[PDB]
Each structure stands twice: as C-alpha cells, then as structure tokens.
C-alpha cells in the first residue's frame, strides 16, 4: 500500500452521479488513478464492461473502445479506463469517478469498479 | 511518461511471454500498466482483459485469474490492469505473459498493450 495513496474506493454502475471522492484538486498537480472490475451496463450476457469500455461483440475487432470508467472535474468529463498515469490536474475542483451510460439507462446497470487514486511528485 | 522504460504488447498465443529486455535488480521500483481484449478460446465465453476472464452467465462479476502476468527470478507475479510501485523482489529481465493452460494457448487470439514505467 504506497504511502502516496490518497483515495480508495468504488464506483457503482448504477449511480449516474458517479463517486465523490472528496479529493479537492488544484489545477498542476499530478495524480495516478487506477481501476479494475466488471461492471454490466444492461441485462444481457453481452452487456459487460471493464474500466477500459464495453466488451468487443459478435464479429467485432477485439480492439478499446470508449472508456467505461471516467473522472467529472469542474463539470467536464475526462476519460480514465484501467488507468491514467501522472494526469496533470487541468482545473480546480472536487474529484468524481463515475461509469459512463446513457442518461436514464444506468438503472439496468450492475457491478462496481474498485479505483485507487495516487499524488504524485 | 517522461520514466517510461518499455512498451510493447502481450500476445496471448504466445505461452513464452514477451522478453521486454528490461533487466531489472532487487529494490528497484516499477509500474506496470495494461490494457486490451484477448481471447482465450474460439467461444464467445472465451474473452479475456489483462484483470482476466469476463464472468459467464449466472457468474459473479468479482475479478478472476489475472491474465496478464509477470516472471522475474523464477516467479510468476499477477499484473492485470496495473501493479503499481512494484518493488522488485529479485533481479533478473522482465517477462509479460498470457496466463492460459499449458498447450492451450494455439486457440487464443489478441494482445495487451503494456507499458512500463522506472519509479
Ligand atoms: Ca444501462
Ligand atoms: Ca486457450
């Protein structure tokens, strides 16, 4: 458990306001956000996702699609997946992580991400 | 990204795992980041990302066996998605690798991303 951590917790799939941390950020600073699990965003087998996005379907390349785990700063939202390393900070305010899906669809939803946050030097 | 010291990709047909050349000794610090979609077998069931199998139908969604993983001194060590300020706990050169059973890696398909960083 590096000593520089300086948030751990989780994000549930189906809560469209996403996580507050409560880590208040100013802008320049540096931090690692780090993230894992599955996550459904809909009721079939195919709906599953990782931190890096939705699975590859039925005849499609087994290639990243649109991150499913994302940080909201300053109401701007910012891709993060499996991990963003040594993120300058672009603005002031209190970090959210949140799973990204439709409005109004996030209540077929399931699962949660277990995301670490790190400052670093 | 200015520590990077190796990228590359992890195939998962290759049971060897990649010589990333990085060599490495005891104490030094590493992170290890990767993403991406394998595939394990010909089925749809058989998808993996580097944090391992996708839950079948009827499965939990917890985290199963690391795909992605590391050898170093003769020990294999779970990655994943990332393992963070890894202190190295023996020296010798950095393998990344494609965890499946043994002569069970011709049916797979795909690769990880990976990068290393020296902290
Ligand atoms: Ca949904
Ligand atoms: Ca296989």
């Known amino acids: 458990a590096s ?14 306001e ?19 699990g ?15 996005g939705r699975i590859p379907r039925e ?3 087994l290639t990243l699609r649109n991150p499913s785990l994302q940080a909201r700063l300053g109401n701007e939202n910012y891709p993060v997946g499996n991990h963003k390393y040594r993120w300058s900070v672009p603005a002031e305010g209190t970090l959210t992580l949140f799973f990204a ?11 949660e991400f277990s995301v670490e946050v790190y400052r670093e030097a």
């Open 59 to 61: 005849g499609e390349t």
């Open 101 to 111: 899906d439709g409005k109004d669809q996030y209540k077929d939803n399931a699962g």
């Open 38 to 52: 599955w996550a459904r965003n809909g009721s079939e087998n195919f709906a599953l996702t990782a931190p890096q």
């Open 18 to 36: 996403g996580t507050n941390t409560g880590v208040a950020l100013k802008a320049g600073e540096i931090i690692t956000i780090l993230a894992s």
């Open 3 to 16: 000593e520089n951590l300086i948030w751990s917790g989780k994000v549930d799939a189906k809560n469209a």
